[PDB]
Structures are given as C-alpha cells and as structure tokens.
Amino acid sequence: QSFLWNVFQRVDKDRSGVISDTELQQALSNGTWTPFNPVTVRSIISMFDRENKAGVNFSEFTGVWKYITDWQNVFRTYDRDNSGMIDKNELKQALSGFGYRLSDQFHDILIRKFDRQGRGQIAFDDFIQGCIVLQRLTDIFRRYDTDQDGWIQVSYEQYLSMVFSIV
Amino acid sequence: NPPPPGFIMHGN
Ligand SMILES: [Zn+2]
Ligand SMILES: [Zn+2]
Ligand SMILES: [Zn+2]
Ligand SMILES: [Zn+2]
Ligand SMILES: [Zn+2]
C-alpha cells in the first residue's frame, strides 16, 4: 500500500504528483548506463495514461509498476547467463511465448531491428519495446488467423489494411 | 557496475 507508494515518490522529482516521461526514464535502467529507451518509456506511459497528461499518477503508476516488473520477470529468466543482455541463443528461448516457433535466423532480423546498443544483443529497454511491436503485429495477424495454424491467406486490401492498421 | 534492469532504487 505504501510500497507501491514510496516507489512513486522516488520517481516523482518535481513533486507535481505526476510521473513525467523524463522522470520515469532516468529512474529506469536498461542495465547499460545508456538512457532508457524513450520510445519504450513513451509507450508504457501512454498505455496507462488515461487523461492525456502524458504521465501517470499513483493510480496510473500501479499499472506501470506491475507492467514493468512483469517484464523484468521475463527478462530475468531468459537472461540465464546473467549479463544484463539477452543474446540470440537466449532470444529464441524468450520469444517462445508468441505461439508459433520462429526460424533460427529470424532472430537475427529481430535483433537487428530493435537493438539500439548495436552490440549484437538485446537490452531490457529494447526487449520491452520489441515485444510491444511484436504483440501489435500478432493481434493483426490473429484477426486473419481464424484457422489458428500460424498461416493466413489475405487479399491486397486486407494486406494494406494490416499495414495501415499498425497505428 | 550499472544498475540492474528495471527500477533503480537509491544505492545502485
Ligand atoms: Zn513528476
Ligand atoms: Zn545473456
Ligand atoms: Zn550471452
Ligand atoms: Zn490453414
Ligand atoms: Zn554502483
């Protein structure tokens, strides 16, 4: 009750009562001393921001703290070598939760697309944003995956519909 | 010696 509350305080610098995007960012660690991915921060904020205030109050921050510790739980387990980074061999073991098993060097496309560190591995902040994009893509896929076998057959319009429904 | 992934509480 105060545990979640005394986390909210230490992250609220200007004491306005709202965790700003900048506040949550520099109160977060990707584990590489580089600034936490602002795109990742912006996403987690807007997910639990309900009055457009581009931030979260204690009510809204509870969802944020839960949403971020649940991701650290995921990151902690698949980071078996415990280097603070998820490598390709550890990525295969991680992205298994999306249903269809993916090819081995499809994990080289994902790691090229979402790694900002550029060291051929995936950090915690980039891991969250990557899955956010991935979940966004699979919701679009599941609409046409009625068959439920990981394969869809769509038209030209439906394809364009899928592309422009990314937002 | 960077802070572990996620929320950083004071004292690293
Ligand atoms: Zn604030
Ligand atoms: Zn690792
Ligand atoms: Zn490794
Ligand atoms: Zn089928
Ligand atoms: Zn230290």
Author numbering:
A (entry chain A): 25 to 191
B (entry chain C): 1 to 12
The paper states:
ALG-2 (apoptosis-linked gene 2, gene name: PDCD6), a 22-kDa Ca2+-binding protein, contains five serially-repeated EF-hand motifs (EF1 to EF5) and belongs to the penta-EF-hand (PEF) protein family, including typical calpains, sorcin, grancalcin and peflin (see for a review). ALG-2 binds one of the two mammalian isoforms encoded by different genes, designated Sec31A, in a Ca2+-dependent manner and is recruited to the ER exit sites. ALG-2 binds Ca2+-dependently to a variety of cellular proteins, most of which contain Pro-rich regions, and binding motifs are classified into type 1 (PPYPXnYP) and type 2 (PXPGF). Sec31, conserved from yeast to humans, is a component of the outer layer coat protein complex II (COPII) and is enriched in the endoplasmic reticulum (ER) exit sites, from which cargoes contained in COPII vesicles are transported from the ER to the Golgi apparatus.
The co-crystals of des3-20ALG-2/Sec31A 837–848 obtained in the presence of Zn2+ belonged to space group P64, and the crystals were twinned. The crystal structure was resolved at 2.4 Å resolution. An asymmetric unit of the crystal contained two ALG-2 molecules (chains A and B) as a dimer and two Sec31A peptides (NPPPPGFIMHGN, chains C and D). Three Zn atoms (yellow spheres) are found in the Ca2+-coordinating sites in EF1, EF3 and EF5, essentially and two additional Zn atoms (cyan spheres) are found in the vicinities of EF3 and the Sec31A peptide in each chain. The clustered Pro residues (2PPPP5) form left-handed type II polyproline (PPII) helices. The peptide ligand binds to a hydrophobic pocket designated Pocket 3, which is separated from the ALIX-binding pockets, named Pocket 1 and Pocket 2 (pink and yellow surfaces). Pocket 3 (orange) is formed by residues that are present in EF1 (F27, V31, V35, L48, A51), the EF1–EF2-connecting loop (L52, S53, G55, W57), EF2 (F85, V88, W89, I92), EF3 (T93, Q96, F99, G108, M109) and EF4 (F148). Several Pocket 3-forming residues interact with the Sec31A peptide at the side chain or main chain carbon atoms of the peptide by hydrophobic interactions (common contact residues in both chains B and D are indicated in bold face: A51, L52, S53, W57, F85, W89, I92, F148). Hydrogen bonds are formed between chains A and C (S53OG/P3O, S53O/G6N, S53N/G6O, A51O/I8N) and between chains B and D (S53OG/P3O, S53N/G6O, A51O/I8N). The Sec31A peptide binds ALG-2 at a hydrophobic pocket, designated Pocket 3, formed by residues that are present from EF1 to EF3, except for F148 (the loop in EF4). This pocket is completely separated from Pockets 1 and 2, which are formed by residues from EF2 to EF5.
